[PDB]
Structure formats: C-alpha cells, structure tokens
Amino acid sequence: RIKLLFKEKALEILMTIYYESLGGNDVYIQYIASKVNSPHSYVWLIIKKFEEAKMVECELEGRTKIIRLTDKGQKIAQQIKSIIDIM
Incomplete structure (x- = not known):
C-alpha cells in the first residue's frame, strides 16, 4: 500500500534520517545505508x-x-509519518 503511492527506496531514506535525528543521533550516510535496502551509491x-x-x-x-x-524536510517527513500511520 505504501509502494502504491511512494517511491519506497527514497521514502525509507527520508524516514531513516527523520527517526535517527529525532532520537538524537548525528545522521551518517553509512548508517542510513546499514538501515535501508540500497547500496551506498x-x-x-x-x-x-x-x-x-x-x-x-x-x-x-x-x-x-x-x-x-x-x-522543509522535517515537515514533509512528519506528514509522511501520519500517512504511514493512516495507511
């Protein structure tokens, strides 16, 4: 249902940054890579x-x-979070 509306790879990257920053971590590109299903490049x-x-x-x-x-990025992520919740 998420794939229905969203580009899943770009979504996962965005929400990873969101949740990692929210928890109080500096977000490293290497960490995002460890969490999502995409190569570093x-x-x-x-x-x-x-x-x-x-x-x-x-x-x-x-x-x-x-x-x-x-x-801008934060606002968008927060709104996507609500969509995922609704979905």
Whole structure:
C-alpha cells in the first residue's frame, strides 16, 4: 500500500534520517545505508536529490558525511509519518 503511492527506496531514506535525528543521533550516510535496502551509491544519489529539493543539508566531518533535515524536510517527513500511520 505504501509502494502504491511512494517511491519506497527514497521514502525509507527520508524516514531513516527523520527517526535517527529525532532520537538524537548525528545522521551518517553509512548508517542510513546499514538501515535501508540500497547500496551506498544509491543512498548518495537520493541524498543529493533531497539536497537539491532543499529537504536535507550535507556536511563532511573528516571523511564522514553527515546529513540533517531542513525545516522543509522535517515537515514533509512528519506528514509522511501520519500517512504511514493512516495507511
């Protein structure tokens, strides 16, 4: 039913960032990869699309890519959470 309406891979990435940040973790690209069913390169591509859409920001801490939701990204994730709940 989720696949009905959503691009499942992009959704899983977004909600992973949401829940990880909500719990108080810095969100690392490596961690998102451990949680979703996508190769590192695909996660990277989707993150760049989210960044383009102004939903996330990226920064490098040494060799470590950290991803944070913008206010826009957060709002969207919260609304998707309610849809998933309703579904």
